[PDB]
Amino acid sequence: LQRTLVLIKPDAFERSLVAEIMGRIEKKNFKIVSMKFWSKAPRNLIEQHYKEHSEQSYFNDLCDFMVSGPIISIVYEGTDAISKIRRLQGNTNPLASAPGTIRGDLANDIGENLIHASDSEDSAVDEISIWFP
Amino acid sequence: LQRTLVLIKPDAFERSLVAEIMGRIEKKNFKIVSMKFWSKAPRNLIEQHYKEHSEQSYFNDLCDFMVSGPIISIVYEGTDAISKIRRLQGNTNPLASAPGTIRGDLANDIGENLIHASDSEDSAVDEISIWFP
Amino acid sequence: LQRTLVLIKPDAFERSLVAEIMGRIEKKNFKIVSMKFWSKAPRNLIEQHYKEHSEQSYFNDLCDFMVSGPIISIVYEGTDAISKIRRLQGNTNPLASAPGTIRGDLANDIGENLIHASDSEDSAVDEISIWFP
Amino acid sequence: LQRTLVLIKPDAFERSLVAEIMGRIEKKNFKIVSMKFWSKAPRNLIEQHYKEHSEQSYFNDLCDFMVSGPIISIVYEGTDAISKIRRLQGNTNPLASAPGTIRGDLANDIGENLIHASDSEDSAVDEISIWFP
Amino acid sequence: LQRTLVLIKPDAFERSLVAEIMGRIEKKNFKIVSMKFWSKAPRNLIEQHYKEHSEQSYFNDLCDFMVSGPIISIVYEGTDAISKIRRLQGNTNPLASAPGTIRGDLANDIGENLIHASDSEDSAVDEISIWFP
Amino acid sequence: LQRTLVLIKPDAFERSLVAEIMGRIEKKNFKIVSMKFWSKAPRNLIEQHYKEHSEQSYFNDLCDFMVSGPIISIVYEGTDAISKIRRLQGNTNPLASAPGTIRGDLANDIGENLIHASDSEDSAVDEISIWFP
Ligand SMILES: Cc1cn([C@H]2C[C@H](O)[C@@H](COP(=O)(O)OP(=O)(O)O)O2)c(=O)[nH]c1=O
Ligand SMILES: Cc1cn([C@H]2C[C@H](O)[C@@H](COP(=O)(O)OP(=O)(O)O)O2)c(=O)[nH]c1=O
Ligand SMILES: Cc1cn([C@H]2C[C@H](O)[C@@H](COP(=O)(O)OP(=O)(O)O)O2)c(=O)[nH]c1=O
Ligand SMILES: Cc1cn([C@H]2C[C@H](O)[C@@H](COP(=O)(O)OP(=O)(O)O)O2)c(=O)[nH]c1=O
Ligand SMILES: Cc1cn([C@H]2C[C@H](O)[C@@H](COP(=O)(O)OP(=O)(O)O)O2)c(=O)[nH]c1=O
Ligand SMILES: Cc1cn([C@H]2C[C@H](O)[C@@H](COP(=O)(O)OP(=O)(O)O)O2)c(=O)[nH]c1=O
Ligand SMILES: [Mg+2]
Ligand SMILES: [Mg+2]
Ligand SMILES: [Mg+2]
Ligand SMILES: [Mg+2]
Ligand SMILES: [Mg+2]
Ligand SMILES: [Mg+2]
């Protein structure tokens, strides 16, 4: 039994894909443990969430985008939930995300990619404490 | 523009229809303005929410059901959101709800009926203040 | 609790709508109690099923159509299953069936209309005994 | 057999509902007989199409909207295609369109209402000649 | 042209996924040759079906589960139907089943995995004779 | 930013999958630049489109099939659209097309495979000029 942190990103709201994305995780039988809606996430929370990317050239564009619209943060719970939800998510790169995955079916940009999911046990605990302190 | 208060009821979680219900409202182009996940709503908020029914025969069963599992409270915003979302919802009575509506398509009980929606401008304001003080 | 008799008609097989139709009933929370696949229903069961129509102008065409491909006979169970499933089904006449209903959404002919559902408690009992003796 | 003229309006493109709308008509078993994609319809065809409204208060806004993005013009064919597709479409007014219909499920504005469908045999013939001379 | 044996397992019934699963195979254009509904399969039929697993530690839990609710057995027919339906099915292990497959989208347990499909020509003939003697 | 040429093949029309296929590309956020409906494509256009296959044993059966019903030709535009739409398409061979892809979910024949998509930059320019001279 693991908990992972999911963000529904502003592009999901703009494109009306919130339910589509949440439904894919719901149908896989993962349960919501916590959920928070953000009309606009504070930029500092975004910078902490993406602290590992602070020196990447895309960091500021990434942060601008993540504050461009609403976000839903969700803690999902289930056996091996972290790796399983990552697999549903699909690869970051639109050249690689597989059809059948969320990004593979729905995303067409490396930045505007609809959804975040924690990539490891270590980062799950981290991100959960950022969004649900 | 109006805002209306929607509850996603515990039967929706039980039957994995949370995204299905939210998706129907999303596809109608209504926007989430506020949202709260409750692992178990406090009985007092429930009795307040349904205060008009407090002397009805079904009141205790209704309150019991509403705390029997998680709920999501959502404020939706759009032109004539109250009446329009009531129409999507469908009649309380499974003998009356029209196919095409949430309850008409998905609910088969007068109590376990998946979704609450505010029925008027005043009750909307009222319910919004209960779930989002 | 009632039980009603449903037939999935040969046009549903032809048009690959078998799961679509069964799915609408399933999502309404009705339970399969009995089920039979017929690669070709015996003409005699069909004439019995539709005995009320035996003197109508359309009778032979109706019987011919009903043996023109496979059918599935299903007994569904739930509260007020008969009337409720009739409502999902929709009007026989394509000029009358409401969007949201099976026929309203999917059928475009008064004969090739995808689904049979028992129309009363007595006809349900009757039809159930024909298809599941 | 009748033929009717359908326009998929620019809001459908904006909201990525082109296939959703065409799919509802396709599932009803109506056949495309003619089809034209317009990156931007010529204003003159639009004013001709809506000539009956030329003196109405909303005319300029309607014409402006109709050239604000792409449209698809389609001629559909089937028994009673005109009235049947009008029924799928739903009422122009978002306070009136029934869930189950295209507009009832998907539109939330009296102007930005996703789809045009010919309203009579004569207007069908008329509109067909405008979009497919 | 091959025939393969599919079981819709009790968890599909509990979770109301019967049509969803059958629809996926139907949409791939496989035809039903035989179909049998079982309110509860006899435990001995289950033990024969899984005779190859008799010495596995999960054998009794597996059999208990397979008699815990209804089952539908289906013989599907089509070119290379055995391998193709296996690929739609997805891997047994929730850590491996690919999004886009039945288990990959819908199953989250190695035991409660919704669907059985024969794994070879040799086992297809075998299983078909168990369920359709 | 690339443009690729897509054909919706006659089997999509016969099976009523036109919207399903177009919707998959639409949901991935690709935009239509040009679209042409063909009640029946001229055989010579088909032979040019498939000129690379002229010496294959399946060439004449392929051409017969492509003129057996309507076709929609579409020019889609987007970043890396050629390779991305190929990946959504899925492999030609029903033994290999992956679930989640168009062919993987929907096609069951190596010839009747629903959709063409240009395989390279060189062939995109070529095919676009054949269908949209
Ligand atoms: C690698 C990369 C990421 N990003 C953005 C989008 C990613 O969701 C976010 C974090 O990157 P990363 O953690 O690599 O992606 P993922 O979300 O798949 O774990 O940074 C870019 O905008 N451009 C890039 O090249
Ligand atoms: C009228 C009624 C309501 N209820 C429950 C279900 C309703 O969702 C809740 C409030 O009733 P009500 O406000 O009448 O219905 P709605 O939810 O359609 O606005 O009380 C019953 O259980 N039995 C009943 O007879
Ligand atoms: C009334 C009628 C029925 N039929 C066929 C189609 C009906 O499904 C079948 C039985 O008719 P009926 O019991 O009146 O319709 P329903 O199936 O809605 O209960 O007979 C015709 O072909 N033409 C007709 O005019
Ligand atoms: C009546 C009306 C129409 N319109 C626009 C939207 C309609 O699609 C278009 C033509 O009106 P109309 O033909 O009355 O509606 P429909 O599209 O349902 O046949 O004009 C308005 O913007 N406001 C209005 O009050
Ligand atoms: C391998 C395995 C199977 N099972 C159950 C679920 C499987 O559907 C069933 C048969 O196993 P197997 O034939 O290996 O799986 P599949 O259904 O993918 O062909 O046994 C377990 O409960 N635990 C296990 O570790
Ligand atoms: C390879 C092959 C193709 N075809 C037909 C179907 C293909 O869509 C068409 C062109 O072949 P090809 O370009 O190899 O396939 P794709 O469409 O995946 O790029 O020729 C056959 O009928 N049989 C075959 O063995
Ligand atoms: Mg990461
Ligand atoms: Mg109320
Ligand atoms: Mg009848
Ligand atoms: Mg009009
Ligand atoms: Mg096996
Ligand atoms: Mg090719």
Side-chain angles (χ1 to χ4, degrees), chain C residues 6-13 15 17 21 49-50 53 58 62 65-66 86 88-94 97 101-117, chain D residues 28-29:
Chain C
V6 161
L7 304 181
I8 306 303
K9 294 177 173 186
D11 53 332
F13 281 87
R15 298 171 63 203
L17 292 165
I21 294 163
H49 180 81
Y50 286 127
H53 306 269
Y58 53 80
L62 165 66
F65 161 67
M66 289 294 293
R86 285 285 278 175
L88 291 182
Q89 171 186 230
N91 195 292
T92 331
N93 189 323
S97 56
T101 66
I102 290 154
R103 288 155 166 186
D105 288 341
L106 306 173
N108 199 38
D109 185 75
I110 194 155
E112 300 182 354
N113 58 33
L114 297 170
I115 175 172
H116 170 88
Chain D
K28 183 76 169 171
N29 210 24

Side-chain angles (χ1 to χ4, degrees), chain E:
Chain E
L1 214 78
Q2 287 176 337
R3 292 181 177 187
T4 189
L5 180 285
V6 164
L7 305 176
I8 309 300
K9 296 177 170 178
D11 56 333
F13 290 87
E14 170 62 27
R15 286 180 64 207
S16 303
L17 293 172
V18 181
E20 171 68 35
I21 294 153
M22 290 179 72
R24 286 168 183 242
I25 303 171
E26 190 180 4
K27 284 178 190 175
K28 180 80 172 168
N29 211 23
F30 291 106
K31 303 309 176 193
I32 297 162
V33 165
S34 310
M35 186 161 56
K36 225 270 201 180
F37 171 86
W38 307 76
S39 58
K40 268 175 198 154
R43 185 181 287 264
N44 182 275
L45 214 66
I46 299 304
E47 296 178 355
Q48 294 317 287
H49 178 82
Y50 285 125
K51 61 176 178 294
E52 303 160 302
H53 302 254
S54 57
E55 315 310 317
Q56 303 309 300
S57 87
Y58 57 74
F59 186 68
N60 207 249
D61 285 351
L62 169 62
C63 293
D64 286 353
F65 162 67
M66 292 291 284
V67 302
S68 78
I71 279 175
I72 298 169
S73 52
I74 311 167
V75 173
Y76 282 108
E77 184 180 63
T79 62
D80 289 310
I82 299 170
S83 71
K84 289 174 182 174
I85 296 180
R86 285 283 277 175
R87 290 188 67 241
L88 290 182
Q89 179 187 218
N91 190 254
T92 329
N93 196 315
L95 289 170
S97 56
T101 67
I102 293 164
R103 288 160 169 183
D105 291 342
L106 307 171
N108 200 21
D109 187 68
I110 188 144
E112 300 180 358
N113 59 37
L114 302 167
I115 178 171
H116 168 91
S118 312
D119 65 4
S120 71
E121 281 197 305
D122 287 10
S123 57
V125 180
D126 225 45
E127 303 172 356
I128 291 172
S129 71
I130 287 171
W131 292 93
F132 301 92

Side-chain angles (χ1 to χ4, degrees), chain F residues 49-50 52-53 86 89 92 116-120 123 127:
Chain F
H49 178 82
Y50 285 125
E52 303 160 302
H53 302 254
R86 285 283 277 175
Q89 179 187 218
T92 328
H116 168 91
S118 312
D119 65 4
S120 71
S123 57
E127 303 172 356

Side-chain angles (χ1 to χ4, degrees), chain B residues 15 17 94-100 103-109, chain C residues 24 26-30 78-80 83-84 87-88 99-101:
Chain B
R15 298 171 63 203
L17 292 165
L95 293 177
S97 56
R103 288 155 166 186
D105 288 341
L106 306 173
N108 199 38
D109 185 75
Chain C
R24 290 166 176 241
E26 186 172 14
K27 283 169 170 177
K28 183 76 169 171
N29 210 24
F30 290 110
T79 297
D80 288 300
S83 73
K84 279 166 185 174
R87 293 191 64 210
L88 291 182
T101 66

Side-chain angles (χ1 to χ4, degrees), chain A residues 21-56:
Chain A
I21 294 153
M22 290 179 72
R24 286 168 183 242
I25 303 171
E26 190 180 4
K27 284 178 190 175
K28 180 80 172 168
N29 211 23
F30 291 106
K31 303 309 176 193
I32 297 162
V33 165
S34 310
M35 186 161 56
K36 225 270 201 180
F37 171 86
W38 307 76
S39 58
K40 268 175 198 154
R43 185 181 287 264
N44 182 275
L45 214 66
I46 299 304
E47 296 178 355
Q48 294 317 287
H49 178 82
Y50 285 125
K51 61 176 178 294
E52 303 160 302
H53 302 254
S54 57
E55 315 310 317
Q56 303 309 300

Side-chain angles (χ1 to χ4, degrees), chain A residues 5-7 36 38 41-52 66 71 73-75 116 118 122-133:
Chain A
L5 180 285
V6 164
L7 305 176
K36 225 270 201 180
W38 307 76
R43 185 181 287 264
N44 182 275
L45 214 66
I46 299 304
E47 296 178 355
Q48 294 317 287
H49 178 82
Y50 285 125
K51 61 176 178 294
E52 303 160 302
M66 292 291 284
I71 279 175
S73 52
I74 311 167
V75 173
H116 168 91
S118 312
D122 287 10
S123 57
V125 180
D126 225 45
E127 303 172 356
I128 291 172
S129 71
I130 287 171
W131 292 93
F132 301 92

Side-chain angles (χ1 to χ4, degrees), chain F:
Chain F
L1 214 78
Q2 287 176 337
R3 292 181 177 187
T4 189
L5 180 285
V6 164
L7 305 176
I8 309 300
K9 296 177 170 178
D11 56 333
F13 290 87
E14 170 62 27
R15 286 180 64 207
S16 303
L17 293 172
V18 181
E20 171 68 35
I21 294 153
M22 290 179 72
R24 286 168 183 242
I25 303 171
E26 190 180 4
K27 284 178 190 175
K28 180 80 172 168
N29 211 23
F30 291 106
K31 303 309 176 193
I32 297 162
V33 165
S34 310
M35 186 161 56
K36 225 270 201 180
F37 171 86
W38 307 76
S39 58
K40 268 175 198 154
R43 185 181 287 264
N44 182 275
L45 214 66
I46 299 304
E47 296 178 355
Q48 294 317 287
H49 178 82
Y50 285 125
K51 61 176 178 294
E52 303 160 302
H53 302 254
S54 57
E55 315 310 317
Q56 303 309 300
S57 87
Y58 57 74
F59 186 68
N60 207 249
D61 285 351
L62 169 62
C63 293
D64 286 353
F65 162 67
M66 292 291 284
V67 302
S68 78
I71 279 175
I72 298 169
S73 52
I74 311 167
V75 173
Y76 282 108
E77 184 180 63
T79 62
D80 289 310
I82 299 170
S83 71
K84 289 174 182 174
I85 296 180
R86 285 283 277 175
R87 290 188 67 241
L88 290 182
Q89 179 187 218
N91 190 254
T92 328
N93 196 315
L95 289 170
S97 56
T101 67
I102 293 164
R103 288 160 169 183
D105 291 342
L106 307 171
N108 200 21
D109 187 68
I110 188 144
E112 300 180 358
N113 59 37
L114 302 167
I115 178 171
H116 168 91
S118 312
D119 65 4
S120 71
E121 281 197 305
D122 287 10
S123 57
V125 180
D126 225 45
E127 303 172 356
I128 291 172
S129 71
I130 287 171
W131 292 93
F132 301 92

